[PDB]
Amino acid sequence: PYILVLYYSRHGATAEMARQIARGVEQGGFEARVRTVPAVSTEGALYATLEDLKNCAGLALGSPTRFGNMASPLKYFLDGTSSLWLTGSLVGKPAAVFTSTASLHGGQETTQLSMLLPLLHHGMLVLGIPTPYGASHFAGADGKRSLDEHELTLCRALGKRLAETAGKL
Amino acid sequence: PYILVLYYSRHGATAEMARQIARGVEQGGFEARVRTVPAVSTEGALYATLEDLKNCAGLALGSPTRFGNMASPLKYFLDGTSSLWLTGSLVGKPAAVFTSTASLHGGQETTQLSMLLPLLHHGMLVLGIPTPYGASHFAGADGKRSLDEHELTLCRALGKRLAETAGKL
Amino acid sequence: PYILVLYYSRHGATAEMARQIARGVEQGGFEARVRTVPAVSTEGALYATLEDLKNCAGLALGSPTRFGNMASPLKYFLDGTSSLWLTGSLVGKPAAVFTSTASLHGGQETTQLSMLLPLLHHGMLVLGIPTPYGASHFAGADGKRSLDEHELTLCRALGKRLAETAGKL
Amino acid sequence: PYILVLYYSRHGATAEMARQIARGVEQGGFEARVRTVPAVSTEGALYATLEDLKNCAGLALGSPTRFGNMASPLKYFLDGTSSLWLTGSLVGKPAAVFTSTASLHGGQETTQLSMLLPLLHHGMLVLGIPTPYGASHFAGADGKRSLDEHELTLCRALGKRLAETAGKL
């Protein structure tokens, strides 16, 4: 009976968003299981496992926007979920996304969008904020800037909405 | 207690897909209300109304792929739904998409994708087929080619899944 | 030897962006031919023609964001360009997009994105701003708010870049 | 005076597509520099370097479709190109994409699409096939199935078109 809040964070912006979403989830009648993934190479929160994904009632996926796509260490953990898609899990379970960007120009909607693609592959029901595809944060080219009362509200709103939908389902 | 199957059709390909989805919906424990929209200019099934959208338990949206986007007469009917977004309806209700293309090259996924965008704006919960974003049909450059046993299965599957989710919700 | 700046405007926000882009185009060594399209129904700048599109050296496409997609009257004019895609024109010619939104939440990137899809169908070379997919404007829920020195800079930058690329090509 | 054909391959499908594109590039008046990237973890062609990307006249990017996104080892190599975006390179240079999928359902257009996002971030001019966003290959759930005369034609066509555009630029 938990929503998995699964994310990756480089300079900790996506990490705080994760926590707030978790609060939302709790407010929504569910236990938040907040997890991350390890760095990758060719040469914090606890690390997520396949079984974490297999057993969640629903999922919130987070990454910093990295050139319009999700961060590779997260992509790496998902690339290792064939089994779960093949036996058709995550199917039926609700999901949402969230992102952080260190950039004025843009790139969050599209990244949120690119992260809903796989969830729709795993056959999940995707929901947003009524950005509209998911919770977003501007971090400022310092990576420094902190959430606002507004961004905090949106994170919990989404977390709460995700949990309530898993409930209603 | 009905799923609105809302679509536009030029040469009737999307129209047959609509019907099959409707069958799915019935199989799924719901009444299908199948509707279309009128042609637009500067100079079949019954026509949809705003109240049709306001009162549905859930929604299936269909168009032929027209240069990677949905057909304008459909876009025109949606552009007239501000009121519904403003008072935040459709929110919470499930939705799916479907498309027809007269083309080898491609363009269906992207069009399905571009049609899920607005549903996520109106705050809906979007579901696919576990293409993966929605039911698709190749019509062949004649516009002629008919559904297969396979494409028919997918249409009802989606319709049934949409209705069952509205149910579970 | 002209770049077609083709757009639709409801409350004139996209219209001013069009003009500025046109200035950019001129700065870039090209004549701007600024055109719009007429309203559509079931029951300003000059109107664009098919031949306007056939003969341009390059293209800038503009719309207000309407539920994550381009405005229907524009979609309607493009839907009438089969001939041009079929005989494979626009192919090789550069193109860019621009948008206006009356909304805080979001929706511009995705709309810009959904408008680059067709250009890639017609086989065009698409370029952005080095949002990153094209020039954007927040209009404020009044539709009232005017361009900034910043948004103005971006519009001409894009127009200038589009024209220069058509040049280099 | 070379087009960088940059790709990742798991079971060698994207690898053959790379080679064919390279042939295209040669036919188009350019030297193909075909490169890949190493596997990533938490615990063939030569490997690409940052300087390979810095000095190309243009770029073709390839991956297998991995849940609607590009493969993580490729994403990892791109995530290490901040410097190049920051000093605004790749800007002005043409680019294309290509993909392989082991799947009936779908996912190639969207993945091609998700790979054009970053290229548009790095400020590149993106071109397709006049799928329409780039060259695609069905590998069959064996990963086994080989290119067709048709898919081969498309790969070289794209490679040739990419090189010719870099030429014209």
Swiss-Prot record, chains A, B, C, D:
Q: Which GO terms describe its cellular component?
A: membrane
Mention one GO biological process in which this protein takes part, according to its record.
Answer: cellular response to oxidative stress
Q: Which GO terms describe its molecular function?
A: electron transfer activity; FMN binding; NAD(P)H dehydrogenase (quinone) activity; NADH:ubiquinone reductase (non-electrogenic) activity; NADPH dehydrogenase (quinone) activity; oxidoreductase activity, acting on NAD(P)H, quinone or similar compound as acceptor
Q: What class of enzyme is it?
A: oxidoreductase
Protein keywords = Flavoprotein, FMN, NAD, NADP, Nucleotide-binding, Oxidoreductase
The positions annotated for binding FMN are: 9-14, 65-67, 100-106, 121
Q: Which InterPro entries match?
A: Flavodoxin/NO_synth (IPR008254), Flavodoxin_CS (IPR001226), Flavoprotein-like_sf (IPR029039), Flavoprotein_WrbA-like (IPR010089), FMN_Rdtase-like_dom (IPR005025)
Query: Known catalysed reaction(s)?
Result: a quinone + NADH + H(+) = a quinol + NAD(+); a quinone + NADPH + H(+) = a quinol + NADP(+)
What cofactor does this one take? FMN
What residue stretches are annotated with the Flavodoxin-like domain?
3-163
Its Enzyme Commission number?
1.6.5.2
Fetch the Pfam families from UniProt. Answer: FMN_red
Q: Which family does it belong to?
A: Belongs to the WrbA family.
Q: How does it assemble?
A: Homodimer.
Question: Under what name is this protein listed?
Answer: NAD(P)H dehydrogenase (quinone)
Q: Identify the species of origin.
A: Pseudomonas aeruginosa (strain ATCC 15692 / DSM 22644 / CIP 104116 / JCM 14847 / LMG 12228 / 1C / PRS 101 / PAO1)
User: What lineage does the source organism belong to?
Assistant: Bacteria, Pseudomonadati, Pseudomonadota, Gammaproteobacteria, Pseudomonadales
